[PDB]
Design a binder for this molecule. Structure first.
Ligand SMILES: CSCC[C@H](N)CC(=O)O
Ligand SMILES: [Zn+2]
Length: 544
């Protein structure tokens, strides 16, 4: 009955999708697929984050327009996400007419409401290229240790940190010219004006405990005004009435959430839903799946912007931790910085979806992809527990009973144990306690395989006159498989499709209350094959 708008953070348009991205998009997709299974109206929304100085400069280096460049990466991103079956209702771009009009609207409202301040700043400027330089486009000699060729505000030899104005003999990364300090008028969003409102939200108990605790540190330090403007040359949206000024990516990037939803509504011919979801009186729910590095932005700056422009605010933020590989930050030299596209050359999407889901919880803890454990857990849980219930039983049904399952359950008590678990498993999906859900599902899978072991179909099959017993045992196992695959349907979309083809039925959450009786199933080849460490070694080598 609910109306739900769910987002993932907008991926940066000048980088390939990697396993870190995939943790976020898989987490959101599992939750979204479960919400759809319970009958709610869900809109799963994302976009590419396509503006800014680095993108402008990279396009110039490539000799193409920024529009061509961001279009190519957007296609690359959506191909990768589609390969992992991330079920977006719309994937748009921050570089769109919808986002331009919404950015201009929100800015004009913030300005009229008194939340935009004008302030002159001083910044390093490349007089040959003719542009202000972000910190990382200034290089020079460390003022402390005198090591040359250091970038930005820190030295990678001695570890010192400093303003780039302290670099000795500074050079523009763009042109090699010596930069100089230049003044420019910038426009600032008066975030401090919203501190009391934001502190109330922090205390409300909606946010994760770990996020609320961190926000208290930020309030203690003191909220600051945030620069929302950039000087030309720039790739982005020009500020009305302010020639030569552009909106900084901070402003237009989250508005891209709104622009993507407006684009979806407009493409559908739906003239009511945008206001239904974004007006202040909305009864729809708005959720953002984000990582730790995006929490300050989504928990303070973004709700303040929405409040100041008369829009509704997020219902909640769902924050996940970083991905590690073999216990450590991804390492290019070790081959553990793994692109999504590369992953799919070696493994399927379901394997990573399952492994992440088994490790995820409602907390912000980092998620470790241990590659040895990945092989063991996928083979143990998917091949040998869940799929085993189908593969060990289907052959007898197809070959000796014409594909027809028994007309009654052999063990109705055991079946009720499986269906009785739906409430706790569903609540685990709902609360984002994914690891809890998987633990209960695999505990049931162990029960199901213990049942089959106890009945010993490999013995019954050879014994004269026991055809009825064999059909009963094998049909019971297949009905337990039906239930487990329903509980796993949000996690494993492609295996589920193969399971539905075998079972000759769509898997619905409520359907488990009616077992398959006197029901024809189809043959299948192999629902899910084993993986091995040679494949992991090939993935690592291909990523170096
Ligand atoms: C509106 S969400 C914007 C997210 C930024 N692109 C940061 C990131 O993708 O890591
Ligand atoms: Zn140094």
């Amino acid at each position: 009955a609910k109306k739900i708008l769910v987002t993932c953070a907008c991926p940066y348009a000048n980088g390939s999708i990697h396993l870190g991205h995939m943790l976020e998009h898989i987490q959101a997709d599992v939750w979204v697929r479960y919400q759809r299974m319970r009958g709610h109206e869900v809109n799963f929304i994302c976009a590419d984050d396509a503006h800014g100085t680095p993108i402008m400069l990279k396009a110039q280096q490539l000799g193409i327009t920024p529009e061509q460049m961001i279009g190519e990466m957007s296609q690359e991103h959506q191909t990768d996400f589609a390969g992992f079956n991330i079920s977006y209702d719309n994937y748009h771009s921050t570089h769109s007419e919808e986002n331009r009009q919404l950015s201009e609207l929100i800015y004009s409202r913030l300005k009229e409401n008194g939340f935009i301040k004008n302030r002159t700043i001083s910044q390093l400027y490349d007089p040959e290229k003719g542009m202000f330089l972000p910190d990382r486009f200034v290089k020079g000699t460390c003022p402390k240790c005198k090591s040359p060729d250091q970038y930005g505000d820190n030295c990678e030899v001695c570890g010192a940190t400093y303003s780039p104005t302290e670099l000795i003999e500074p050079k523009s990364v763009v042109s090699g010219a010596t930069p100089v300090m230049r003044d420019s008028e910038h426009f600032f969003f008066d975030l401090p004006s919203f501190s009391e409102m934001l502190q109330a939200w922090t205390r409300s108990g909606a946010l994760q405990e770990q996020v609320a605790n961190k926000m208290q540190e930020w309030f203690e330090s003191g909220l600051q005004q945030w620069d929302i403007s950039r000087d030309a040359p720039y790739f982005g949206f020009e500020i009305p009435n302010a020639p030569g000024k552009y909106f900084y990516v901070w402003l237009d990037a989250p508005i891209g959430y709104m622009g993507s939803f407006k684009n979806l509504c407009d493409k559908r011919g739906d003239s009511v839903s945008f206001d239904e979801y974004w007006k202040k009186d909305s009864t729809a729910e708005l959720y953002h799946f984000i990582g730790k590095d995006c929490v300050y932005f989504h928990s303070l700056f973004w709700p303040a912007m929405l409040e100041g422009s008369n829009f509704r605010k997020p219902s909640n933020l769902f924050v996940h931790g970083y991905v590690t590989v073999n216990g450590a930050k991804m390492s290019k030299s070790r081959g553990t910085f793994i692109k999504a596209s590369t992953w799919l050359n070696h493994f399927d999407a379901d394997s990573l979806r399952y492994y992440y889901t088994a490790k995820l919880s409602s907390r912000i803890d980092d998620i470790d992809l241990n590659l040895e454990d990945f092989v063991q857990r996928v083979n143990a849980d998917i091949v040998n527990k869940v799929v085993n219930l189908a593969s060990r039983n289907a052959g007898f049904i197809n070959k000796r009973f014409d594909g027809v399952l028994a007309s009654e359950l052999a063990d109705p008590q055991l079946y009720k144990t499986f269906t009785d678990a739906a409430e706790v498993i569903g609540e685990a999906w709902e609360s984002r306690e994914f690891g809890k859900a998987v633990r209960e599902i695999m505990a049931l899978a162990d029960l199901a395989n213990r049942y089959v072991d106890e009945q010993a179909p490999w013995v019954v099959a050879k014994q004269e006159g026991r055809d009825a017993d064999l059909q009963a045992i094998c049909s019971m196992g297949i009905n337990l498989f039906r239930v487990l695959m329903t509980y796993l349907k949000p996690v494993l979309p492609k295996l589920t499709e193969r399971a539905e083809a075998f079972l000759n039925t769509e898997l619905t959450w409520d359907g488990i209350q009616q077992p398959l009786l006197g029901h024809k199933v189809n043959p299948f080849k192999a629902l899910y094959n084993r993986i091995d460490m040679r494949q992991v070694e090939a993935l690592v080598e291909a990523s170096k």
